[PDB]
Subunit: 200 residues, 6 copies
């Protein structure tokens, strides 16, 4: 009685999100245009069997896999949507679940902050930061969701919709966080897109 | 609905505590004699707004800033108390809170251990120890509080009161932990002063 | 108030478990054949006193010592079983506890997966793996228990019983995790012995 | 030990720190973070531990702050920051006088490698993003400018100038080591401008 | 200009043996190899020239970048593909583009090799604890070690040792001023592995 | 199969009795079996780096010393051997030196590339020092500081032990592995000048043995 908690499909990874996920991935690496499936199941120890099923079902490659007590996560990459989707479906059949059984994203913090200062920028740039640098004077959008993975979708759509800089995209754990920066207007556009993407 | 979890004001950083915080800070660095304000707010994501407010309110510098879900922390430094206090005043007005809304320190452990052995020292000295080294044969004082930031006040007041060695001051997370070492008598003076400091806060 | 959470005595560290614990230990190091006692105690801060008592009680050496709020753990090593058991005995008398007061292991996952793929093997090999490498095509046994420390007994017994490869043994935290690999038949042999070892502690 | 033993491997003065460089320097150094527009004096010396004397002298001569101090395998480096150009230069003057040296006595930079590479591949880009990168992310398709020098310190000056002259992205500026390594990326036109600026800066240090 | 480039290491692995593939996947920062994949490893001076070589190699064929790193002084990379000819072609294009050839590669100097039998428990833990990325050594095992200069060459030694013998890979540190190979297991197996490692280094020198 | 004549004995250093801070520091910093204060320590450094394995194996098989450290760095290999009994440590050292056809007086001689005392460390300087990959104790601004850089690197260990014998100072770091060895002590000016003198004596005694 494994259960699905998160399912997030990304048809095509935007440039920065691809570079970002490429930076933090601990398995195979994604490249721009790759399709990506992010899943989360409980209990966490079940992620291994799910991973094995996914990898044997197709040519999809494994980018990430994290085991915690309560939940486990994995990320799958391939240039073909169909390959990614097929592996998803085989997994879903094997555990007797389906997309709609996933928990929906609830956003618990959404905010734009203007003209960040140099001290604030250093701390942002230093602490577990895997994307690009924020420069003081920039504006910033921050977003938190639960479950965590859905933040990948917000990030991709945000990037599709505006000229901004990806700073960090935390998709692991119970809480998803997105941080992006740039000119205030672009940032406000990205924020709207991000929130919109979560609302579905 | 930002809430105040912790507020800890330090008038003047004692030499070891400033060296220690100098060691662990990921932002601007403190030096001996700086004032420091440490705050925790909930939810954690709120620490970014508070930080921005704080740094635009005055000439304070940001020393630390940490996000977790339930809460976040920040540490502010400046050579002038009024500068540090002003940023605090501005933050508390901005979020509609006040000092006496802070969560009261709960002390979960307090003890002195005499004549630490070599293996014990090595483990202490190695596992995320950012202060000075403990030597086997020293006595040691350990303190745990909840919420965490309060141990900074216990540490500054212990150093003020006694000739001891700061080994570690864990102020981030849900639980604060202080480790001091030295000669038994000194360690006992430090222990008493650390406990006084927390008690004051509890009774404020 | 100081209570015993876990008690795990290993009569003799098998070669791979010795080399694994030797890799991760942050104090004194174990060598093959050494006897080992792992204890968990609550609250976490009590582990310092328990450690001091153990080391002053005999010639055991301290290999690990971890503090978390709810509980803390320590590992004791010595070539002689009697020396290790004695330190445990002195600790249990000092805190008014005994072995049968420990929390029984609860197994939340046990599974053998055959013919692991290359991507899957790389993630395992990279993410805090401290033991040996898993190779794709190998079979794998994964075990999770709570409390954590009991996986050490499962690992040692698995090694005694079968020709396998130790990939990882997480004994710290609330949840213990064992990962072994090798040829299918051997891995199932190891899996069965691991389970026996845990059930045995459950029924003690 | 005698100041006669000291080699002044790098001496580089940055009048005004550009924004990306300032953000990067703050991220990467172990000292007091700079503000964009601050002046910075960077020095590198041999033997490594002589950097302590240079540091003590600099810090007691003015209100400069210590932005960086590091002792590497062989060499010691420091950065001094202040918003006032003259405050920084005064600390420099006091140091050079104290060690019996002067700007022109500084070891001249040799360029061991420099290149623009267009249209970086996805594979190439992700390796770059993954190998101890402290700056911003390179994206495949971008062009890239690469500069390696010895001594290492000079890439700092090259980096600041390149940022002045063009719109590009700073990936890394590794100014400590046997060799200094500057990496920046962006649109080919911009990158080419940055490249020329960087090379000019290095050449000027030579013909000075 | 390419004339400045010293080709410190050129190594071609026809087929990555299982342990070495598991190892190179664990330690490398690029796309992981599948066992059996061919691999080309190159090391150049000056260090940053590895960028040009990398870009030429990747633009020339379907190889993947398994590794690329610039160390204190030197730059190295690993190219992977299932098919020998695809990897080889990448290397050919690179060597032409920089005006070099396999026989111009710097020749490995062997700065240290030996077999040590019956490793002690103290010695074993220290090996297990010092930045080890491979498998665990057990006391009582024999050990083969090899240090070369340039560093890249231990990679060929390792693959060939794995072909010849049933041993355990502890580490293959192919980046640095010196390259360092550490293999362990039963004495006779280790002696076979050792002999094959040395023949591999000699074969390189006499190509 | 390499021969011992290829081995350069870069450092040979015998510590009769590890002083308290140095014992704590070496236990913190090393990757082997931690020392007890008072323990004897034999520290050796060799070229080529991987030759340290042969030295290690001979050392351990000759006596009951524990391996307190063994490391192969960019170029060089070092180890530390501990035992409470002076003679037990010396024996391993004797067996090792004979096995490689060497002797104490063949050790490469320490060159001092830098040494000085700086008084009244500023707050800025002090904080960088505490932040620079430090394993030892904290320096406080206002203290004086002694620094010693040698080549080969291992020799700073002997200087550190002797300095702690002579004065009440604070060990900040003793980096004995690398192209250069680096020692940093701090304290009250008088005490630091005393420590400095003893450290320098120790390096000179080595060259004159």
């Amino acid at each position: 009685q494994i259960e699905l908690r998160t399912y997030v499909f990304l048809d095509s990874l935007q440039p920065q999100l691809a570079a970002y996920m490429g930076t933090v991935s601990r398995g195979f690496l994604p490249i721009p245009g790759d399709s990506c499936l992010w899943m989360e199941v409980s209990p966490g120890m079940a992620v291994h069997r799910v991973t094995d099923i996914a990898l044997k079902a197709s040519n999809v490659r494994l980018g990430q896999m994290i085991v915690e007590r309560a939940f486990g996560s994995l990320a799958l990459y391939h240039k073909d949507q169909s390959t990614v989707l097929h592996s998803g479906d085989v997994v879903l059949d094997a555990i007797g679940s389906e997309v709609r059984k996933r928990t929906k994203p609830s956003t618990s913090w959404t905010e734009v902050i203007c003209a960040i200062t140099p001290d604030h920028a250093v701390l942002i740039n230093r602490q577990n930061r895997s994307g690009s640098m924020i420069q003081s004077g920039m504006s910033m959008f921050i977003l938190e969701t639960e479950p965590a993975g859905y933040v990948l979708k917000a990030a991709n759509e945000a990037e599709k919709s505006a000229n901004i800089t990806i700073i960090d995209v935390k998709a692991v754990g119970a809480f998803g966080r997105l941080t992006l920066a740039g000119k205030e207007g672009d940032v406000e556009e990205a924020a709207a897109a991000a929130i919109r993407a979560i609302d579905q």
